[PDB]
Structure formats: structure tokens, C-alpha cells
Structure 1
Amino acid sequence: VLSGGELDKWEKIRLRPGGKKQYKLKHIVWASRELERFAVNPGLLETSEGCRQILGQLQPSLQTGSEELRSLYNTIAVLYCVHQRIDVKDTKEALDKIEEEQ
């Protein structure tokens, strides 16, 4: 789902801006599982374009969505910046670079 060099990037990112907690492998695994429970092709995770399609498919449901959904949307955003080789240090930053594209 992620390359070798990308993992080392992934494992450097923090969940909260000032947090002392950062992403691990468990997040990717769990994300692919929850992707199927929502009737989505988990294969779309290993490409930057696949994530673009997923993120846009979930953008609307976010406003009315549950806390469990936003969490998923966030993890995919962070994972998108890694594929795009965009450098980010925490989830907030990832969401910002994704909104800058619009």
C-alpha cells in the first residue's frame, strides 16, 4: 500500500500539530479495512490519483458525517501528501495543502 521510502516519511508525521504522537503502520492497515466497510476499493490507496478520487468522494459527507468518518478522511489526506512527495509535519498541514489545491 506504501513504498519503502514513503513509509519512513509517513512515520515522521504527527497526528496533532504540537503532538508527541505520530502515525504508524496500524493507521494504514486500519484505513484499508474501514475503506471496504464503506464499500470502497482499497486498491486506490497505493496511488496519488486513487486518493484524489477517494477524498473527493467523501468531501460532502464530512459536513454531516460522524467522528469516525472525519478520522478516515484525515488519514487519507496525509497519505495523499506522501504519494505526492509533499512535505508535511502533521495532519493539519496536510489538510491545508489539500485545500490549497481546492
Structure 2
Amino acid sequence: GARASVLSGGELDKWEKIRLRPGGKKQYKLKHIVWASRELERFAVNPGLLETSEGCRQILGQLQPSLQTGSEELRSLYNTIAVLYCVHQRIDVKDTKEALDKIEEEQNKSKKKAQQAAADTGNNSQVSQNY
């Protein structure tokens, strides 16, 4: 509308600090911040979510289970949005690889913690014999 893209200069310095490839030297550019935001609108997702780190958390979650269904276009997004969330959490990644994994690995740890409380609910009755 009247203004596109949030991340200001002071913040951009961090966005342009993230690499694109694992063993490459390419970095991120505004072009990507927009190329992604312009996708959310079509992905039934509000572009005002990328403004906050929390907003992205909800986005990646939706595209997560779609990483398989969606086409190559859905893959390029996850790799991008992943770099953003890290920038907002004051987290510095090494590239589009360490970034995506840094988020994918975090979901694996939460999965166990989410299905661990069930134990406290279940009946805990131990028993041991002796001579």
C-alpha cells in the first residue's frame, strides 16, 4: 500500500548478514524480504505477521505440513521466512541451511515435551521384590 516492507536500515544490516547457501558467500537482500511478503498475501496469510517474530512462528507452522504438498515455491518461502524469524529473535544464522534446520530441530524438541506431560497424568505405580 502506502508503504511496503518493515525492517528498517538498522535492522536490514542483520538481514543482509545472513548467507544464502551453506558453502557459499551470497547474502540476503531486500528483494527476498519482498518476494516473500508478496507471497503471504496469496497464501491467505497477512503480510503484517512478518513484522513480528511471533507472527512468523505461526506462518512456518502452516507451511511446515505443506513443505511436502506445496510446490518448489513453498520450499523457497520456508527457507526465507526461517531466516527472518532468526533475525527477529536476535539469532544469527550461518546460511539458509543452518537457519532452516535451526527451526526444524526446535520443533522436534517441542514434540517430545508436548507428549511428555501425558506421563504425569497416567498412573505411576512402581513395584520391586527382594530376598
Counterpart in the other structure of 1:5: 10
Q: In 2, Cα distance between the equivalents of 1:11 and 1:49?
A: 21
2:64 match: 59
Residue aligned with 1:74, SS: helix
Q: Which consecutive segments of 4 or more residues in structure 1 shift more than 4 A?
A: none
SS at match of 2:61: helix
Aligned partners of 2:9, 2:105: CA distance in 1, in Å?
28
* 2:1 pairs with 1:32: no
Q: Is the 8 A contact 2:18 2:92 kept in 1?
A: no
Bigger drift between 75-84 and 4-13 goes to 4-13
2-structure distance, mates of 1:50, 1:3:
17
Identity %: 100
Instruction: Please give the alpha-carbon distance, in whole angstroms, between the structure 1 residues aligned to 2:102 and 2:67.
Output: 18
TM-superposed CA distance for 1:64, in Å, is 2.4
- C-alpha distance in structure 1 between counterparts of 2:72 and 2:105, whole Å: 23
Tell me by how many angstroms 1:99 deviates.
2.1
Kept in 1, the 8 Å contact 2:16–2:28? The answer is yes
Following the alignment from structure 2 to structure 1, what is the Cα–Cα distance between the partners of residues 25 and 81? Answer: 20
The answer to whether the 8 A contact 2:78-2:100 is kept is no
Unaligned 5+ residue runs, structure 2?
1-5, 107-131
Scaled by the length of structure 1, what TM-score is found?
0.92
**C-alpha RMSD over aligned residues:** 1.1
Q: Which shifted more, 88-97 or 74-83?
A: 88-97
Q: Greater CA radius of gyration, 1 or 2?
A: 2
Tell me by how many angstroms 1:92 deviates. Answer: 0.6
Structure 2 match to 1:88: 93
User: 1:21 Cα shift?
Assistant: 1.8
TM-score, normalised by the number of residues in structure 2: 0.73
**Which structure dedicates a bigger proportion of its chain to helix?**
1
Distance 1:79 1:13 in 2: 9
